Structures are given as structure tokens and as C-alpha cells.
């Protein structure tokens, strides 16, 4: 499969999440995603085919993971925006007030701005600390998907937020949305990964 940020993958034939970013660890191909998406060794599939397994994850506390893929996968330095793509150029962290967009299999590509950093989400499983908050909307299934600036600086991966009863926070004004992402920098250093760029 062609690995692009934002596309759907399933975990153990049950849960759905979105790919965050193509990465490599030495000769190993992988993608970073959210820790809540799977436990170590869970099976990820794209379009019904097995593409790899969860190599490591941390959740709750943090919310990160990487999936090691088979050598047949093609890694691409891109994030889906509808039928178009955003090229990944690096991982400089943007500041509060910057515009950012996120991509995921449920709500597609949505943009907003960064409103706060170092936010704690008290999920039922336990708290997740240090997340960055944005006001782009998102829904069930977007977890793990890419957060990136239009200039291509990858910011992190979708964790969670204040989903409403219709399964997203897109039906409430941007001022009332809390859409949280795990910063990418610490995931790259924690697992020794290099982002694929173009």
C-alpha cells in the first residue's frame, strides 16, 4: 500500500485509526500514529491487507505509537488533503496562534489554529499530559492522523477531544472545540525515527 498521512488503517480487524506520518528506523519502514489505536504486536491492515504490526506504544500518560511495516509498503512524504497532497518537509514545532490542519479518515482535512500547549486530557483510561490544543474539528476515527502546517512542518498526531453526540466536534463553533494532538518531536526521539520528507 502507499502510506500517506491521514488514510485509514484497521487494528486487529476491529478498530479504525488514521496514519500520522511515514518514518524509517534504519532500514525499517514504519508510520507514527496514536498509542490508543493498538497494543504492541496488534495487526494493522490497509484496504484489507496486512501491512505491519504495532512496534511500540505509550497510552495513557502520552498517546503515541509506531507501526513497523513490511518491506513491500511504499512510504511517501505526503499527507492527504482530499484528492490532493501536502508535502512533508520537516518537524519544526509551530507556536500558539499558528494555523494548522489535520487529516484523518472520518472528517477529512480540517484547518484551524493552535490555541494552547501542554494540555492534560482526562480520558477514562487515565490522563494524557502535554498535548497541544487546536480548534480544527475532528471525529471518531481521526486518531493517529497527521497535524501539519500548510508549509509542510509536521506537528503531531491526533489524540482526542470534545466529541459531541454526532461523533465529531465539527457541529460546534471553532471557539468551543478542544482538538488535542500529541507533539511529534518526542515520538521521533523516543523511538529513534526519521521523518520521510520530499
Amino acid at each position: 500500500a502507499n502510506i500517506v498521512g491521514g488514510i485509514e488503517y484497521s487494528i486487529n480487524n476491529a478498530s479504525l485509526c488514521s496514519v500520522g506520518f511515514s518514518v524509517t528506523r534504519g532500514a525499517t519502514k514504519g508510520f507514527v500514529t496514536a498509542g490508543h489505536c493498538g497494543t504492541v504486536n496488534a495487526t494493522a491492515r490497509i484496504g484489507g491487507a496486512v501491512v505491519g504490526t504495532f512496534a511500540a506504544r505509550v497510552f495513557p500518560g502520552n498517546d503515541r505509537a509506531w507501526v513497523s511495516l513490511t518491506s513491500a509498503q511504499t512510504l511517501l512524504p505526503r499527507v492527504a488533503n482530499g484528492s490532493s497532497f501536502v508535502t512533508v518537509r520537516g518537524s519544526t514545532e509551530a507556536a500558539v496562534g499558528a494555523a494548522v490542519c489535520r487529516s484523518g479518515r472520518t472528517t477529512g482535512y480540517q484547518c484551524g489554529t493552535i490555541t494552547a500547549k501542554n494540555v492534560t486530557a482526562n480520558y477514562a483510561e487515565g490522563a494524557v499530559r502535554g498535548l497541544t490544543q487546536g480548534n480544527a474539528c475532528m471525529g471518531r476515527g481521526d486518531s493517529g492522523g497527521s497535524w501539519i502546517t500548510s508549509a509542510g512542518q509536521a506537528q503531531g498526531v491526533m489524540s482526542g477531544g470534545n466529541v459531541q453526540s454526532n461523533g465529531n466536534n465539527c457541529g460546534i463553533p471553532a471557539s468551543q472545540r478542544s482538538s488535542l494532538f500529541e507533539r511529534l518531536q518526542p515520538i521521533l526521539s523516543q523511538y529513534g525515527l526519521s521523518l520521510v520528507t520530499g
Binding site: L16, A34, A121, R140, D142, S143, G160
Partner: peptide, 6 residues
Amino acid sequence: AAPXXA
């Protein structure tokens, strides 16, 4: 808040 996932 809930994580997400689907």
C-alpha cells in the same frame, strides 16, 4: 474528552 480511535 475522549480519544478518537473508531
